Amino acid sequence: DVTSGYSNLDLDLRDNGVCVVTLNRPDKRNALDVATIEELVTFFSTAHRKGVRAVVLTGAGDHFCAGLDLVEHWKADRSADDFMHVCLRWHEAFNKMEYGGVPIIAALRGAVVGGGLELASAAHLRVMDQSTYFALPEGQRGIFTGGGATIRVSDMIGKYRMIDMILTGRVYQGQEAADLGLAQYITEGSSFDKAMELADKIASNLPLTNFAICSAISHMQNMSGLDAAYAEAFVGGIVNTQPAA
Amino acid sequence: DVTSGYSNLDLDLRDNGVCVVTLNRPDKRNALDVATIEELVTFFSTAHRKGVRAVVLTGAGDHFCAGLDLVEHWKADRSADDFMHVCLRWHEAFNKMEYGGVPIIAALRGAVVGGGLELASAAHLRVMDQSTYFALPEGQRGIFTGGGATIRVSDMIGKYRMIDMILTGRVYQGQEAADLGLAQYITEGSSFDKAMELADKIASNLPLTNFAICSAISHMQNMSGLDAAYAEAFVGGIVNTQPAA
Amino acid sequence: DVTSGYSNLDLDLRDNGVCVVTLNRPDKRNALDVATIEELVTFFSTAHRKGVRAVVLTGAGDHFCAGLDLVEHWKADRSADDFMHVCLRWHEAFNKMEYGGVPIIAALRGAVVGGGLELASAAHLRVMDQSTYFALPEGQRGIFTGGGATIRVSDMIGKYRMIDMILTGRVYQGQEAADLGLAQYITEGSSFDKAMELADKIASNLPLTNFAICSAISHMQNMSGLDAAYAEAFVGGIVNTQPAA
Amino acid sequence: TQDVTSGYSNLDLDLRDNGVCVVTLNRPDKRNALDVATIEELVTFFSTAHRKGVRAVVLTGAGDHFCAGLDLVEHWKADRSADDFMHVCLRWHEAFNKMEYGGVPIIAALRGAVVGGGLELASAAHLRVMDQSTYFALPEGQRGIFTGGGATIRVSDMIGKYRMIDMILTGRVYQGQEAADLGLAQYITEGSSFDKAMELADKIASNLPLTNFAICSAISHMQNMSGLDAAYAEAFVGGIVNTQPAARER
Amino acid sequence: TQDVTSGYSNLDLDLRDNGVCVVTLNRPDKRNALDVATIEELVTFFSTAHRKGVRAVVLTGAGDHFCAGLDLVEHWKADRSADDFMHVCLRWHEAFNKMEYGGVPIIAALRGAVVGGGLELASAAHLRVMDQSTYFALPEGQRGIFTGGGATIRVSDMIGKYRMIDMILTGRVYQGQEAADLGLAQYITEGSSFDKAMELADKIASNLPLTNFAICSAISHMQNMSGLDAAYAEAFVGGIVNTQPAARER
Amino acid sequence: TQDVTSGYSNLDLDLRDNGVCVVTLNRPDKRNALDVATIEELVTFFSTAHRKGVRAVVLTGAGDHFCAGLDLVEHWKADRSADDFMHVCLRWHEAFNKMEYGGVPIIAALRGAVVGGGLELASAAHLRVMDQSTYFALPEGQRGIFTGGGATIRVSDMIGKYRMIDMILTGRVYQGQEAADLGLAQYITEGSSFDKAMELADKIASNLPLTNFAICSAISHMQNMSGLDAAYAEAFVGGIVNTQPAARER
């Protein structure tokens, strides 16, 4: 019951458990409105229990994701509390992606900007192609990132590089972007095909091992290394003694 | 009342709110004595409320800053508690810079060493030129960094690279230094002019947006990502619904 | 009484206080069994009080360390709690290395894989040669890292690169590995000789300064920067006012 | 509004006109022991309560005992591996995190046994009201069992780490005023804990939604941070909550 | 020494010969409500007290009530936006952080209302002395207001997160021995809280400056860290404090 | 089994047949003041107790007083520099960390003075049993000394940061039921604290080794984390402990 029914996500579940999840509004470069965020909360809250083994996340069209749907935003005439609540929903979706235990590999193309970079950062692995570029351009437009960029992008490229990106609108692309920490993989070919290659290999690993890799490590990074040491020992104890292992 | 009156800092407030703050003792490569640290505490404690929009921090002369004023130090014949108190003042100055909400862009030249690298690290952005080099040389002289290097330089280049720098006295310069994380910008020309270009653009952004960028992100990095998610939503709520925004 | 007596470690204490510590089972690429881990706990729990000034850690033979002794592991038929306890011993050894206050420089050759990369990560400095390669290959074999990789390797190369390494089994070597953060030094010659050069220089520094560098910095990185600021001031107060300093 | 009470099997739900929803465990025959299906219903209810418009929740257990803890019959029969049980524990934690950090005030009306996983459920509420029949314990420890539903976090936050360690290490039982004074419940009544909980809930429901949302989510987050970073976050929560038009209106 | 008492308008200051400085809120006509100008004077006083040589502070409010909290008249009139109010809250936090982490022992002599922002101010002191007229509350919540001056941090540290949530969610008032036992004040007197605070302050002022500095700054920092990292920092604080020549002299 | 009791000079050790080991400080002539050699023996004993098979420890001091704290005679004579003393403090911390996080339940049987470093030692135990002669204080502060053996961490966890600050800032002494209620000891007896500690230890020793190990190590680690990360770790501790064959057997 994985492909249940979603309006704003196109799903393709392959026989080995890899589910392609595609943002489906290329006419607006897949900008994320509140309904799409809720479908991401739902999908990533249930993916593990529904048996999904890995996810390849992509955006329909030439551009991965332009970020916050500004048309919806401007029209909603939001108060500070209304917008704070919208941001909590973005965070719920991305927390379910990051800490959910289902490996997520993003196949990037074109503009990975603003909230779109926040969505890409919620994946475990990112594959960029020759057309891909990254930025947090809204900062210069007076907009602060409220979907996790200050957390995940800093974890990806360093707090001072993330501050630079939002303070100046600086753009990164090509090898320079991969080397900075924006994506672990860069291809001269299809980022979708490379993501699928990675996803198929990951899906052939043990479910429990991938679950721990895709949830425990982020938690350990939130604590003192002297307390994470103890938690890591328990994670290794459970994962490495499973019959299948 | 920004250029009020300081003995150890030369100030130049431009019409757009950018304030150039220049260490003014080139004869001693701008080494930082206790009086200069107190003026940095005062300036950065009040800059935001005095209306400063951005700061370009520089050192008069060929060298940004040589660090701790050792002549004052040796002559003061400090006990462990006396020196601990001096370090707390350094930290107060740099905390007001980092968490104060006023964007600070350092225009580096020559030696950015020891406490001088600690001062540069307290800025949000760093611009280095072709003469700039970085080191924590005192470590080999038996001196531990007590002005935040263990915190900020580790945040800039990684804990293990910071440990290497103080343990061995290793020097970095050129593109290698920029790539390591010591400065986000490297220019073949004037680091002052490049810093001013960046500062003028930043000063044209909304005051509240820059305030959040230059205070909230450092705070979020000090907490678990699962708690920063909630705080970030409130920061976005306030910043993105301001009338000006 | 440094070279006391160990079965699984070969020790060579030099006249300047540098102790070479060599894993001594090249026939199994120095895989770490429980007895070797206990000797590492013992050696690194007492090295500082026994007067060791620096340690050069190496593996006998062409390969630094292959990781967990799988023959012992499979034969022990471990329950989840048995294995959790083994992981706590690995962590105790590596915590004594990291926070013990005695500088440790690892001279790497060949395969630095799995638990072997966890051991190398517990050193302060790493020197790699032209034959050195790094990986966490067990992940694809269903094995989770329970000896600190999720903590230290993430601190070395970034959480998302560490997740990539264990999720995919990706290998790094050469300049690419040094640049990623796996080793601060890469040599075209002998990694042992380069490690000794570094170690001899470090051993000529003050004992207290090296102790603080090799214990305080890791602790500061486990707290909010606003609380580490205060602790760092006390560390600087004690280190910088010692008579020898 | 939206339907709040339909579609559940393991929770009895009663939505009052002022937005207070009574959530009642409904298996007194097994002292409301929590099986995996009940935990999943708690996840669903507490993941959606705020957005559905629920203003406050009074949590109770049908019968003489609030909740005896994890359903051991189900546990025993399942012959769970360490990973299977770790997964069950993560679901308990998801339900309790949605209760604690969800922003909807929860007031537990306690009676009889509030033990093991039942004390973990009670600890996920913001307020607890106990009566003269109420008693508290973490007895599983004496049975070789560790608390995997938050007791080590929330009960420590309620009574102190060393008193929580004592309870699980020794099976020590607390009741009456001593239990209230220890930090196990903020309110103790000589009468009906349900009626006192409803009094508290009706007053809470009369306050502003955003103010209750912040009180019932932000404070727990602030306690997980250094006080020097929570200071900054609290200033932003105060800025949003205290300038809402409805607050000025008051 | 340096001048400590001059130049202020919203604080009455009295420096005694042994270094104890009485700091008194001086607007009893409005129950010492704290406006932005008073907060700024607290920032200035507590940012410089240690370096000026102040050995201890006895903090009090003129009149029958210590402090009723934020100045609502000023608040209402200012018609503040969320960002304007967030900025006001950061100033309150700066004043209270300089009190808590500044290294100068602060003993609050309480009387009457210690409510809302007034309880936040009292919580920024190291020690609190209450009298028989003293009462505590965070009533703003019932008025749709959230505490933005540290109550969620310090009052939780004083009485427990769940009792702090209770106070702001319900407006519950505490007084007398019950308040002292809850953790709202370490000392309760049947007489003058000011006189008891001065007794405590005079004894504290007789101890070594560095020892009091560490006690009144390091402990709060240690509580923001994992205990396994605070262990290391505490060893360095002990090393510096316990080997100062003056300590040996004792 | 392995030898547990031989080879020590500064600890009297008595291993009972059920695995409870009585560890007794043995210098009543100096009220069991802790010198560096005794701290090193505590490091050795508590670093190996779990692996040697010790099931629980009852910690006591010979004579009328549990422990008066750091050995000042040794301290004074050593004329320690700040770094020398910081190093001594790290050894105290290593001994107490091995006690707190080692996984072997420790029950302290207190009598008489539990002061300064002696309260730090007592605080490293999981449970404390006090008698009618027992009193607690951190008097060193009045003597210009700061606690460098964990009091700022563990005593704060026991009684609250503000009560710990009060104790060291003022030298305040606690005893009797007031001390127990404050959080200084979970058990108070009108009889023998040693006999009550042995009763508790014998019951604890009858429980499963792994369950006691987790209770006596995991909970302290969880309290050093955000509750949202401890939730995940606790689920893994529950998974391992609750599926061990011996637990099912129960």
Author numbering:
A (entry chain A), B (entry chain A), C (entry chain A): 4 to 248
D (entry chain B), E (entry chain B), F (entry chain B): 2 to 251
Could you give the paper's own sentences about this structure?
DmdD belongs to the crotonase superfamily of enzymes, homologous to the equivalent enzyme in the fatty acid β-oxidation pathway. The structure of the DmdD monomer contains two domains. Consistent with the gel-filtration data, DmdD is a hexamer in the crystal, which is also similar to the architecture of canonical crotonases.
The crystal structure of wild-type R. pomeroyi DmdD free enzyme has been determined at 1.5 Å resolution by the molecular replacement method. The C-terminal domain (CTD) consists of three α helices (α9–α11) followed by a long loop at the extreme C-terminus of the protein. The CTD mediates the hexamerization of DmdD, and the long loop at the C-terminus also participates in the formation of the CoA binding site of a neighboring monomer of the hexamer (see below). The active site is located at the trimer interface, and the three active sites in each trimer are identical to each other due to the crystallographic symmetry. There is one striking structural difference, however, between DmdD and ECH. The C-terminal loop (CTL) in ECH is positioned nearly 90° away from that in DmdD. Wild-type DmdD has strong activity toward MTA-CoA, both for MeSH release (equivalent to hydration of MTA-CoA) and for CoA ester hydrolysis.
